[PDB]
Specification:
Elements lengths: L7 E7 L4 E7 L5 E7 L4 E4 L2 E4 L8 E8 L6 E8 L5 E6 L16
Antiparallel strand pairs: 1-2, 2-3, 4-5, 6-7, 7-8
Length: 108
């Protein structure tokens, strides 16, 4: 269902504190800024990235968003260390079971 793309603009993601910042329009038509911490639903699992877990940037580096053919989407890729200590590249699409209300930001 709907995502924070068209509803919000100026998608920012700091790789240190992993916080997503973007301006969204409220029901009153007013524009406000919102922040979100993915670490809450993203953790490391034997070298892979999955939803439901937490604490991932601590064991991962080079996190960066990537725009596809249409700037209406950005994709999250990060290198996460494995339990043996090896480094591997994983990928994950934020667009999915996540959405933002007109004036509030909460999972759908």
């Amino acid at each position: 269902m709907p995502n924070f793309s068209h509803t919000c603009s100026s998608i920012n993601y700091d790789p240190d504190s992993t916080i997503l910042s973007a301006e969204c329009q409220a029901r009153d038509g007013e524009w406000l800024p919102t922040e979100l911490r993915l670490s809450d639903h993203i953790g490391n699992i034997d070298g892979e990235l999955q939803f439901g877990d937490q604490n991932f940037q601590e064991t991962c580096q080079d996190c960066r968003l990537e725009f596809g053919d249409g700037e209406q989407s950005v994709w999250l890729v990060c290198t996460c260390q494995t339990m043996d200590g090896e480094w591997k590249s994983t990928q994950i699409l934020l667009d999915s079971q996540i959405d933002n209300n007109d004036s509030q930001l909460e999972i759908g």
